Amino acid sequence: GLMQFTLPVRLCKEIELFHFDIGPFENMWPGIFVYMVHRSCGTSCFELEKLCRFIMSVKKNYRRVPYHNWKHAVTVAHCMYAILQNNHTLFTDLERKGLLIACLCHDLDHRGFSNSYLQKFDHPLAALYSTSTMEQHHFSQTVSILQLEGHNIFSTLSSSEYEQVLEIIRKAIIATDLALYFGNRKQLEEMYQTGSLNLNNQSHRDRVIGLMMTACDLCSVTKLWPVTKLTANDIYAEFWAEGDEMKKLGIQPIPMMDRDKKDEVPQGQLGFYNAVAIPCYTTLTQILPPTEPLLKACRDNLSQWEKVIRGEE
Ligand SMILES: Cc1cnc(CSc2nc3cc4c(cc3[nH]2)CCO4)c(C)c1Cl
Ligand SMILES: [Mg+2]
Ligand SMILES: [Zn+2]
Incomplete structure (x- = not known):
């Protein structure tokens, strides 16, 4: 109960910033996530024993692919953490709980292939789920892990709160x-x-959370140029x-x-x-003004890509 996670000073400070990079030490990523859950949600949101077992089961169900891997999961969760921390009062207790878990789980069991490739390959998942094929798989995998003995981090929610948070995670x-x-x-x-736009309209909140998920998912474009x-x-x-x-097919x-x-x-x-990134962070900045640093970082990176084309790098 009185057991906090603490980070080294540089991480303690930089983790609050949108452009934080979680570093190359894989063994620190679970603690970074728990730290973020504790500050975002509370030291009481989850039973530490259950959370740690959920985190390690999620990690195991990410594959060794170049990008859609465990590092991406934690990176996307940190972008959500930064959004939630800069918008303290806009989100319910359930939403803060749900969205960090949704982000950690959003690419569970990714094979490194698009929905298009699954459909053209005629992969079994494309028969099970005709649209958002991988994303329905990711949610399916999240529910599976929540149902492992000792892994139900939501056990202490009432029946209706449990149904609400699972619905937040699914849409997310x-x-x-x-x-x-x-x-x-x-x-x-x-x-x-x-x-x-009305944030008390549930259908409107869903849309806003959706855009937050796109923003967190693409957050690679909001880091410092070298990242x-x-x-x-x-x-x-x-x-x-x-x-x-594709060429093999x-x-x-x-x-x-x-x-x-x-x-x-x-x-x-x-x-x-x-076409995607600037529009995404522009609309997000309009709805949630404190997320402006994401749009600024994105514009900086657009400028760096323009310099590559002009042969200046
Ligand atoms: C975060 C992120 C960063 N970069 C990308 C790549 S976007 C993109 N890269 C490209 C390279 C190309 C062409 C189109 C492209 N679109 C035609 C010629 O070569 C994605 C898809 C994401 Cl999700
Ligand atoms: Mg995905
Ligand atoms: Zn992703």
């Missing part, structure tokens, strides 16, 4: 399907501009393997996944910043 994880982001952000853009650039290597290491597997992959078009990556990054 489904919302990480980037195919759904475009429509979600358009709707939020209209609602904010016509002034109809952003080195993470892009891991992202493309996965995409180019998928591209290779006799399908030319999209240029994003074709390692033969490495040269066009800087231009490809521009389109991504302009």
Whole structure:
């Protein structure tokens, strides 16, 4: 009960910042997460024994893929932690509990392949789940782990609170399907501009949480340039393997996944910043003003990608 997690001084300070990098020491990532749960939620939100066993089971169910790995899970949870800490009073007790767990679990058992690749391969998961294939799998895996003996971190919620938090986690994880982001952000853009946005409207909160999940999921573009650039290597290491597997099915992959078009990556990054990232953090900054540092970091990184194209790096 009186057992806090404490971090070294540099981590204690930098972990509060949006652009924090969790570092290369894997063995510290569980403690970093628990630290964030304690400060975000309370030392009482979860039984420490149950939380630690849940964390280690989640870690085991992430695979050794270049990008959609355990480090990504913790990185996405930290971005959510920074959003929640900078918006203290906007979120319920259940929402703070649910969203950190949703983020940690959002890519459970990822194989390093898009929904598109599963559908073209005719993977069994594509028959079980026709849309948001991997994201329905990720939520399915989250429920499985919660149902292991000694792993139900929500046991002390009432029946209705338990149903609410699982519903928050499900929507949150489904919302990480980037195919759904475009429509979600358009709707939020209209609602904010016509002034109809209402955070007491549950359907509106869902949309806002969805955008928070996209923002946390893409947060690689909101780090300092050296982190952003080195993470892009891991992202493309996965995409180019998928591209290779497309060519094995006799399908030319999209240029994003074709390692033969490495040269066009800087231009490809521009389109991504302009079509996805900047719009995402702009709408998020409009709804939640204290998340502006994410939009500022993203704009800085767009500027660095423009400099790569102009041969200045
Ligand atoms: C965080 C993040 C950062 N970067 C990306 C890559 S976005 C992207 N990279 C590309 C490279 C390309 C083309 C299109 C691209 N779109 C055509 C020629 O080569 C993603 C998908 C994410 Cl999720
Ligand atoms: Mg995902
Ligand atoms: Zn993800």
